[PDB]
Nucleic acid binder design. Structure first.
Ligand SMILES: [Mg+2]
Ligand SMILES: [Zn+2]
Ligand SMILES: [Zn+2]
Lengths: 49, 48, 1303
DNA sequence: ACGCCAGACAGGG
RNA sequence: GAGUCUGCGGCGCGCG
DNA sequence: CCCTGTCTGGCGTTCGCGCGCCG
């Protein structure tokens, strides 16, 4: 659940970069940012009630 | 010393509260025998 | 140096915001990382708030204390510690006003009620969204004259200022049908495609036409008016006084057409939002509306007059107290100090700051951006859009959550703790003060029984003591040679391997006669804390005395008790005089002891005093034959007659042994001739008594405890085994007869022997010890077959599905109870000394229902819902409780545990509410002279329809014990004087008399009828101090009462008690007869009807199908009498039978529950409380203030008293008794401090502010917050002043008087 | 989820 | 002739 | 315009102690 909450968070920002990347070279870093998934998963195993 | 403890000064919770309340528009002033001032904050409230 | 006697909340004047203020925070600059120093003028700047460092300044021109009160010549830094930084205030000057959310969103909109606007929706409408107002005069029309106070919009306001401006674009190359400044009318074509929509002057734009509601006046010579100025009819415009205007309006000097048009709109003053309410508020003359409301109030019908009355109190309170209402609008926001909301370094570089700062940033930012958005250019939509956000922000710091909840960015969806949040709730700021939560000289460890210990002392771990009495020890170290100085003595003790055995000597010496207080987990009553003499001991655990284990609900499975230490010689005094254990033996609830021997003691003291019985097969008649003595004495020596045979006068056991002196009897015991529980004859002081050795031994222990041996047998019964009650009663007697401390001696004495006898007795539970009756097999089979009959009776169709069930339950309900008495019957006749049994019989341990579950059978356990199971639990715990019977029984255990969890919370809450209303109640008096007393009934009406009966011994005792007779009563022969406090013995007399038939009631003083407004006197309260003599003046009765009710509650049920303290309409209501006549009933189909009637009128009582009425067609029914069956509604009963009836109802109806549960609390307490429920009343005939009002009863007694007595003109102040629940009386009381504690800090303060309320400190709640001395106790004005003398100083002062003779 | 109190507005004469 | 500064809000569980 | 009724709007919900975790 949290993993998919995180997937949505990532997919959230990736859509913003679909418009941000100038031309075609945008597969790697232009679409992915590991910040959300980490905070989400991490949050669950150390902070979840 | 083996002496007799002095007599209590105002508790900080009260002082901290009055100002908390002052943070809010409200004005909490202590008063005397005849409704007049008295000072909780020993002398740090008067200005300058 | 004066004493703070009165505190007062009042509204803040913007000038006062500035007056308390030091500097203005004008920028959102917390602290710049590089240097953890305050950034700029920002939130933490030190000018605005204070010295970031100790005594030192800024730059360092002056750095110590010599010049403590002067400021640096070049930099302004006055200094004390950084505390001056944490007490000073800063203010933020908001652009366009915003209002306090505390005043706008409280249920009754203080501004909505004051300002007649839609109390809740018109406000929210123009406060946060978009609608504008006209201040003094604006001569031109909208269609109607200028609106003095009403509000207009930007569009119709826009139109007005430049005339009637509406721009009409024209397509390129297209010419207009009007001249440069031609008069155009509504509907005229200004061009082929364009058509004007209003009258005015068509002006040419470079492309477009701008019409203007205006006239047009041409001029040949220069103009005297300028574009923008306002004009009226006559006012000159140009060419000298030749060109004059004819209408009010703005001016536009068009030098393109050499003309001056005067648009219809003149000097019009305008503004909206908080801005619109600030205006309205300023223009109100409270006096006028006051008068206005007065008329409105008393003259029209109740609909609009009722509104005016609730609208007149606020206007009142403002004018009255002074501090005027225009300050309800915020234009200057006070900034809480810097240190208060911590900007601290956490870890690695992490910084934590109180969330208040995030919200302060919010406001600052928005106000600023707004300042900039108004100066740049102002497009309406964007100005409002911001003022909105602005307005919301202002709420945020004040109160978050009233309207939406702000959050720190993605991390924690948590409401930033807003100022309201900081001041309210369970763990809030108002609650931190009141309960003052953390002692410096405190401790806590696990408790463990200390058998040899005397109630006087407690075993405290030396190691614990060392830290606890550290400073007291340090000094003592120096008094001796162990240490040179304090710092020395400290280092000496900073390590455990460094303590010389000499230090312990010192400590042992420092605690000599000092005492400490002990606390238990829930502090339910005053005995929740007791003082004892610490006797230093080894280890971790804290030794506690067994007898006190009852006061604090504490057993030894791990409970931990806290420990404090009285620092002052004053605190120690009281702590050892009036707070020590041994002096508070009786309970404040009931005059019954609390030092009653517990379960262990009683088991011992019982065992020793019981008589045994064994076998009678051959004749039992020694009463008459002398051959019966011989024969039955030889038959005993034989195997035929036992030493304890049912043989009337004397069983052979008495014939064989006769003991001269007392001692004589016990020596034979020790030598094995007679067991202690054996029946023998003994020669006492003047009688040949036939009593067992044990019984005689007990006699001695008591007689020894207290040397007055004759007074020891006067108050003891050696005619029965010593039960918890026989003992309970021996303590009480001993308390009254011989004196307090001497009783304490007796307690320990019993304590010691009960414990010893206990170990020797050898009572122990064994599996076989639980003994199953042989009859169980029978009763179960007997009831088993009967169950088949019930089944065969249903399988035929005789019994309804229901009848079957209800009948089967009744079969087990009876059969189980049958096995109950059976088991006990077995123990009684065959095993008098059964381990399990004796524990239960002795006050020791056990419960008749419990025993049953072991030897008998635990039979019916209900399902989840509540419907009991049809199948019982045929087993006992002796034999295997089967797999399912266990599961089935589990459901109940679970509801029990959930129930206990929710009762504990509600038990502490009830103690909170009782205290919220009865804390102020304290004994401070002189026999209050108003003799209006209460009569304690001794007989009760309907158990069975109507039959008079003597109330229970218990109940009646509860009502008259330790009371003060209001009037003299001559009963069975004795003359009970007035004012006399009837002892338990006296209340035994009156019952015996009612038995004979001489008294039906009892005139007795009670709190229910005291005159002392705030307080209760000695003659009214009564006896029960923790001691048995009259109540000492200065005793906190309110609390003592509140507590005695809140402890038993945890045993209850409670839901009713709540319905009772809180005037409510219970589940099953009972229609009370508002009229008193006789009753009569009807037969029609649908609804039945009970009528209280007369040949004049009947009080129609609609009694639906389900209601069971027991008043019949025929006899009388007084006002407030049950005409339906079940519970009653206090309000109605008040109306019908009156207050003197409500009070007594409430009281008895509350006692009904505790009674039924075993609790025995004195009526005094529930009275104290209930009184406060009615310390308020409504007004129907004014004098000083307007009619509809709910004010303090006694404050009217004041008013009426001096209005008829001192100042003439009998303006009778007619009132109406008002009933309120414990909760609402606390919510709505006089002082606010008390109210700020529970209800809604938010509301309580609002109102208290509006009306500059001066909290005269009386009562313990409000005066505790201040950390000031308690108005009750030693702060008792009665004893706060008392001096002591020595005959030596008495003469010396007289020598001072003698020297007064001059020459 | 709940319970309770107090409230402001809308429907039927 | 010593005294500063840190430990908060919440969460979970366990004892009484 | 009045009184009555109904959904509506705001607040509150033992006490103390341990331990451990987290921005
Ligand atoms: Mg326990
Ligand atoms: Zn300086
Ligand atoms: Zn009295």
């Amino acid at each position: 659940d949290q993993f998919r909450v995180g997937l949505a968070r990532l997919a959230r920002g990736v859509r913003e970069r679909m418009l941000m990347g100038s031309e075609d070279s945008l597969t790697p870093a232009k679409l992915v940012n590991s910040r959300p998934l980490e905070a989400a998963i991490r949050e669950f195993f150390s902070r979840s009630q | 010393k083996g002496e007799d403890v002095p007599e209590p000064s105002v508790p900080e919770s009260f002082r901290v509260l009055v100002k908390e309340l002052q943070a809010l528009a409200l004005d909490v002033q202590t008063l005397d025998e005849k409704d007049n001032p008295v000072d909780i904050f020993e002398g740090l409230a008067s200005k300058r | 140096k004066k004493e703070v006697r009165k505190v007062r909340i009042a509204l803040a004047s913007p000038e006062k915001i500035r007056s308390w203020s030091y500097g203005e925070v004008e920028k959102p600059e917390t602290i710049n990382y590089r240097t953890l120093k305050p950034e700029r003028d920002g939130l933490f700047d030190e000018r605005i708030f204070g010295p970031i460092k100790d005594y030192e300044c800024a730059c360092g021109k002056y750095k110590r204390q010599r010049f403590e009160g002067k400021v640096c010549e070049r930099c302004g830094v006055e200094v004390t510690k950084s505390i001056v930084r944490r007490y000073r205030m800063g203010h933020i000057e908001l652009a366009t006003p915003a209002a306090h959310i505390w005043f706008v969103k409280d249920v009754p909109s203080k501004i909505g009620t004051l300002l007649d606007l839609s109390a809740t929706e018109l406000e929210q409408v123009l406060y946060f969204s978009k609608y504008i107002v006209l201040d003094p005069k604006g001569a031109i029309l909208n269609g109607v004259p200028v609106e003095k106070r009403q509000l207009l919009t930007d569009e119709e306001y826009r139109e007005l200022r430049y005339g009637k401006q509406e721009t009409y674009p024209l397509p390129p190359g297209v010419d207009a049908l009007v001249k440069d400044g031609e008069e155009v009318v509504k509907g005229q074509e200004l061009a082929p495609g364009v058509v004007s929509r209003l009258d005015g002057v068509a002006l040419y734009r470079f492309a477009s036409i701008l019409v203007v509601k205006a006239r047009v006046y041409p001029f040949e010579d220069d103009v005297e008016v300028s574009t923008g100025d306002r004009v009226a009819p006559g006012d000159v415009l140009a060419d000298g006084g030749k060109v004059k205007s004819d209408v009010y309006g703005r001016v536009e000097v068009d030098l393109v057409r050499n003309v001056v048009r005067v648009v219809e709109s003149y000097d019009i003053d305008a503004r909206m939002g908080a801005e619109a309410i600030q205006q309205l508020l300023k223009e109100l003359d409270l006096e006028a509306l006051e008068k206005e409301l007065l008329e409105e109030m008393k003259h029209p019908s109740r609909a609009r007059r009722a509104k005016a009355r609730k609208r007149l109190e606020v206007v009142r309170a403002f004018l009255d107290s002074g501090n005027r209402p225009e300050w309800m609008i915020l234009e200057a926001v006070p900034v809480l100090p810097p240190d208060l909301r911590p900007m601290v370094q956490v870890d690695g570089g992490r910084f934590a700051t109180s969330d208040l700062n995030d919200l302060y940033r919010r406001l600052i930012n928005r106000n600023n951006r707004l300042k900039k958005l108004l100066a740049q250019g102002a497009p309406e939509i964007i100005i409002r859009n911001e003022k909105r956000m602005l307005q919301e922000a202002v709420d945020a710091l004040l109160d978050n959550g009233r309207r939406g909840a702000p959050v720190t960015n993605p991390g924690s969806d948590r409401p930033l703790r807003s100022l309201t949040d900081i001041l309210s709730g369970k763990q809030g700021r108002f609650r931190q003060n009141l309960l003052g939560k953390r002692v410096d000289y405190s401790g806590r460890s696990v408790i463990v029984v200390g058998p040899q210990l005397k109630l006087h002392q407690c075993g405290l771990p030396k190691r614990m003591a060392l830290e606890l009495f550290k400073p007291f020890l340090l000094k003592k170290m120096e008094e001796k040679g162990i240490a040179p100085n304090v710092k020395a003595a400290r280092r000496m003790l900073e390590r455990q391997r460094d303590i010389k055995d000499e230090v312990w000597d010192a400590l042992e010496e420092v605690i000599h006669g000092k005492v400490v207080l002990l606390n238990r987990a829930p502090t339910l009553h005053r005995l929740g804390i007791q003082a004892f003499q610490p006797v230093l001991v080894e280890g971790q655990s804290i030794q506690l005395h067994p007898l006190v284990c009852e006061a604090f609900n504490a057993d030894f499975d791990g409970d931990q008790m806290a420990v404090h230490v009285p620092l002052s010689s004053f605190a120690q005094a009281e702590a050892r005089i009036q707070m020590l254990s041994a002096h508070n033996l009786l309970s404040p609830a009931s005059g019954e002891p609390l030092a009653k021997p517990s379960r262990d003691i009683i088991l011992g003291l019982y065992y020793i005093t019981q008589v045994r019985k064994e076998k009678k097969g051959a004749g039992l008649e020694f009463a008459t034959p002398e051959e019966a003595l011989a024969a039955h004495e030889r038959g005993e020596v034989a195997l035929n007659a036992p030493i304890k045979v049912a043989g009337r006068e004397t069983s052979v056991g008495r014939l064989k042994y006769v003991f001269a002196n007392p001692d004589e009897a016990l020596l034979a015991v020790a030598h094995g001739i007679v067991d202690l529980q054996d029946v023998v004859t003994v020669r006492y002081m003047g009688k040949r008594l036939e009593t067992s050795p044990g019984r005689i031994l007990f006699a001695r222990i008591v007689a020894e405890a207290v040397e007055d041996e004759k007074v020891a047998w006067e108050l003891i019964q050696l005619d029965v085994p010593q039960e918890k009650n026989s003992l309970k009663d021996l303590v009480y007697q001993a308390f009254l007869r011989l004196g307090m401390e001497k009783t304490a001696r007796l307690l320990d004495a019993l304590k010691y022997y009960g414990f010893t006898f206990s170990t020797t007795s050898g009572i122990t539970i064994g599996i076989d010890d639980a003994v199953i009756p042989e009859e169980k097999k029978q009763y179960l089979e007997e009831a088993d077959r009967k169950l088949l009959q019930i089944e065969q009776a249903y399988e035929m169709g005789f019994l309804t599905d229901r009848e079957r069930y209800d009948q089967i339950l009744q079969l087990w309900t009876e059969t189980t109870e049958k096995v109950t008495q059976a088991v006990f019957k077995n123990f009684e006749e065959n095993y008098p000394f059964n381990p399990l049994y004796v524990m239960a019989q002795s006050g020791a341990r056990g419960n008749p229902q419990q025993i049953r579950q072991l030897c008998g059978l635990r039979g019916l356990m209900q399902k989840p819902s509540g419907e009991t199971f049809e199948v019982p639990v045929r087993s006992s715990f002796r034999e295997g409780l089967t797999v399912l019977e266990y599961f089935i029984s589990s459901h109940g255990a679970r509801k029990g545990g959930a129930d206990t969890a929710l009762r504990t919370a509600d038990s502490g809450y009830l103690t909170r509410k009782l205290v919220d209303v009865t804390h102020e109640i304290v004994v401070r008096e002189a026999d209050c002279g108003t003799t209006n007393y209460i009569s304690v009934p001794l007989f009760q009406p309907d158990e069975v329809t109507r039959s008079l009966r003597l109330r229970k011994r218990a109940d009646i005792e509860a009502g008259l014990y330790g009371r003060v007779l209001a009037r003299e009563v001559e009963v069975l022969g004795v003359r009970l004087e007035e004012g006399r406090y009837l002892s338990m013995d006296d209340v035994h007399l009156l019952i015996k008399a009612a038995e004979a038939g001489e008294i039906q009631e009892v005139p007795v003083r009670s709190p229910l009828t005291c005159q002392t407004r705030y307080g209760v006197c000695q003659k009214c309260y009564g006896y029960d101090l923790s001691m048995a003599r009259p109540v000492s003046i200065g005793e906190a009765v309110g609390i003592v009462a509140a507590q005695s009710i809140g402890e038993p509650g945890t045993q209850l049920g409670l839901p009713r008690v709540i319905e009772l303290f809180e005037a409510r309409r219970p589940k099953a209501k009972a229609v009370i007869s508002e009229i008193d006549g006789v009753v009569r009933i009807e037969e029609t189909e649908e609804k039945l009807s009970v009528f209280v009637e007369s040949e004049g009128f009947s009080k129609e009582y609609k009694l639906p199908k389900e209601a069971r009425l027991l008043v019949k067609d025929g006899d009388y029914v007084e006002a407030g009498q049950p005409l339906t069956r079940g519970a009653i509604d206090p309000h109605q009963l008040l109306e019908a039978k009156g207050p003197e009836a409500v009070e007594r109802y409430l009281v008895e109806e509350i006692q009904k529950v505790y009674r039924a549960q075993g609790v025995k609390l004195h009526d005094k307490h529930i009275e104290i409380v209930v009184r406060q429920m009615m310390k308020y009343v409504e007004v129907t005939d004014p004098g000083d203030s307007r009619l509809l009002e709910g004010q303090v009863l006694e404050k009217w007694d004041v008013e009426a008293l001096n209005e008829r007595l001192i100042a003439e003109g009998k303006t009778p102040v007619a009132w109406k008794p008002l009933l309120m629940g414990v909760t609402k009386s606390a919510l709505s009381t006089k002082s606010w401090l008390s109210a700020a504690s529970f209800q809604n800090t938010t509301h309580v303060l609002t109102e208290a502010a509006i009306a500059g309320k001066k909290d005269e400190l009386i009562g313990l709640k409000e005066n505790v917050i201040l950390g000031r001395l308690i108005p009750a106790g030693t702060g008792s004005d009665f004893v706060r002043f008392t001096q002591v003398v020595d005959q030596k100083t008495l003469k010396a002062i007289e020598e001072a008087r003698k020297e007064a003779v001059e020459a």
